[PDB]
């Protein structure tokens, strides 16, 4: 089938900057999937906003094909307030699939170290290098 | 010292020997208004008022023996009640 990267580009909101490249989008989706296996993830606007307000640190991934736009139009400047890097991807179905849920989600906040279990700590250690290189490539934009 | 002092600013960072504060008070301070603590002791006077209307900052001119590096984030700085003037004055009249 057609990939959701090329499919959802007409639906991308005008303020969806920075937008990930296809290789970067694949790396972000893989990192989100590994973090969801680590359970080091916040899904949806409510959880992401609450975690940002408490002071959690990580990476924010925002879907681009969001209608209406007032669902997510406060997230990027709120991430800038708390010094958290963010990046936009064009598809919310892919974000939900990588975020270990059946239905699509709007925004994902990877917070490393958010799981109390030791198995979650080991999974954090194994996806840590991918998370670090993704964050460096996002901040390089 | 005045009997009643109101919390005026919160510490942000030092800048060239001055203390930058985000205003936690709704009103604008007088120029050279003294800045106090909860102990009513003066640490300095207001040096500069800056920033947008929604987010006002002010820098304090530190006195003798008062160092900007000695203060930490979350410290509150207090002003006298008569040293505040309403923000409606600086806005143009209708």
């Amino acid at each position: 089938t057609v990939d959701n990267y090329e499919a959802r580009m007409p639906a991308v909101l005008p303020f969806a900057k920075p937008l990930a490249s296809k290789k970067l989008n694949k790396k972000v989706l893989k990192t989100v999937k590994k973090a969801s296996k680590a359970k080091n993830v916040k899904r949806g606007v409510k959880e992401v906003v609450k975690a940002l307000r408490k002071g959690e640190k990580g990476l924010v991934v925002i879907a681009g094909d969001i209608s209406p736009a007032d669902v997510i139009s406060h997230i990027p400047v709120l991430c800038e307030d708390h010094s958290v890097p963010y990046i936009f991807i064009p598809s919310k179905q892919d974000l939900g699939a990588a975020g270990a849920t059946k239905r699509p989600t709007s925004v994902v906040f990877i917070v490393p170290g958010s799981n109390k279990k030791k198995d979650g700590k080991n999974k954090e250690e194994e996806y840590k290098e991918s998370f670090n290189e993704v964050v460096k490539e996002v901040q390089a934009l | 010292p005045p009997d009643t002092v109101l919390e005026m600013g919160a510490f942000l960072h030092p800048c060239e020997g001055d203390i930058v504060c985000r205003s936690i008070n709704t009103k604008i301070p007088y120029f050279n208004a003294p800045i106090y603590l909860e102990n009513k002791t003066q640490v300095g006077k207001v040096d500069e008022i800056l920033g947008p209307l929604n987010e006002v900052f002010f820098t304090i001119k530190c006195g003798d023996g008062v160092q900007a590096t000695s203060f930490k984030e979350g410290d509150k700085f207090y002003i006298a009640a008569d040293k505040l003037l309403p923000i409606e004055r600086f806005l143009p009249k209708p």
Partner: protein, 58 residues
């Protein structure tokens, strides 16, 4: 939700149940976003829309 819409040549709404039309344009959700009177993010929304000229009357 199920109500989707597109914009016609005149600018008015065309209502569909389809996520993608026959022409291939992705439809938009008709219902507005959830609002709370105690919302505290007008500064963030205004800043983001002002970075891209999306503020009405700008």
């Amino acid at each position: 939700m199920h109500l989707m819409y597109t914009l016609g040549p005149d600018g008015k709404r065309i209502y569909t149940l389809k996520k993608v039309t026959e022409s291939g344009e992705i439809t938009k959700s008709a219902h507005p976003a959830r609002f709370s009177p105690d919302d505290k993010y007008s500064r963030q929304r205004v800043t983001l829309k002002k970075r891209f000229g999306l503020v009405p009357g700008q």
